[PDB]
Write a protein that binds this ligand. Structure first.
Ligand SMILES: COc1ccc2nc(C)c(O[C@@H]3C[C@H]4C(=O)N[C@]5(C(=O)NS(=O)(=O)C6(C)CC6)C[C@H]5/C=C\CCCCC[C@H](NC(=O)O[C@@H]5CCC[C@H]5F)C(=O)N4C3)nc2c1
Ligand SMILES: [Zn+2]
Length: 197
């Protein structure tokens, strides 16, 4: 049967975190590939969630997700409409806006949220999936220039991650990057003003 064969997409799965709790940022893995794949099909994740910045994966892609205002946020171009695995099964998005490249699920129990920035700073810090902290000078409301131009491979797979102000508040989450000749020159982010409700 055609219809009896039709499968459902898996869930997004938290497979790690970027620990920002001390004086040193570092990535932690909390689930390997096989467990990720199994957890994606069942949607049941018994792992204890911690921190603000999660490493997340689908069957095919991996990226980041950041908790702000009690919502775990990430990019639509990573997560699409997918549910997220939780200790109680798959959890449906409570926010979806493809026009902002944004989705959100209720923050997992045990997680913490970052504080939205109110400083109006232009000195930003992008945290990557590799726990690199990359100085960015803000350009207007939703863009930023890299102070230090690195290869664009350094930024691949960090969408959903936070841009932070000097005090560690969330200014937005990383959405896109602009390069020239393969060197990253600027970034676009979803302002924290939209990361609420
Ligand atoms: C499908 O529904 C939608 C809805 C809205 C929507 N909105 C945007 C902007 C969009 O873009 C897509 C995905 C996004 C991306 O790659 N995001 C990053 C990442 O890391 N992704 S990822 O985590 O690897 C991944 C893929 C999730 C797992 C962080 C970069 C890092 C490196 C980029 C490498 C080369 C790619 C350069 C692109 N450049 C660019 O578009 O610049 C724009 C154009 C001019 C201004 C500027 F904003 C770019 O950055 N893109 C291309 N797709 C969609 C799709
Ligand atoms: Zn701030």
């Amino acid at each position: 049967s055609h219809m009896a064969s039709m499968k459902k997409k898996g869930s997004v799965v938290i497979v790690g975190r970027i620990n920002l709790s001390g004086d040193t940022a570092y990535a932690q893995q909390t689930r390997g590939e096989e467990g990720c794949q199994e957890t994606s099909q069942t949607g049941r994740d018994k792992n204890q969630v911690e921190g603000e910045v999660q490493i997340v994966s689908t069957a095919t892609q991996t990226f980041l997700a950041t908790s702000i205002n009690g919502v775990l946020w990430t990019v639509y171009h990573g997560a699409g409409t997918r549910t997220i695995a939780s200790p109680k099964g798959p959890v449906t998005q409570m926010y979806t806006n493809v026009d902002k490249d944004l989705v959100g699920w209720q923050a997992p129990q045990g997680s913490r949220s970052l504080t939205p920035c109110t400083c109006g700073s232009s000195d930003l810090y992008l945290v990557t999936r590799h726990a690199d902290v990359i100085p960015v000078r803000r350009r207007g409301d939703s863009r930023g220039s890299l102070l230090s131009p690195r290869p664009i491979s350094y930024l691949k797979g960090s969408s959903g991650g936070p841009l932070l102000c000097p005090a560690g508040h969330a200014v937005g989450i990383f959405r896109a990057a602009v390069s020239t000749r393969g060197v990253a020159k600027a970034v676009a982010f979803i302002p924290v003003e939209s990361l609420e409700t």
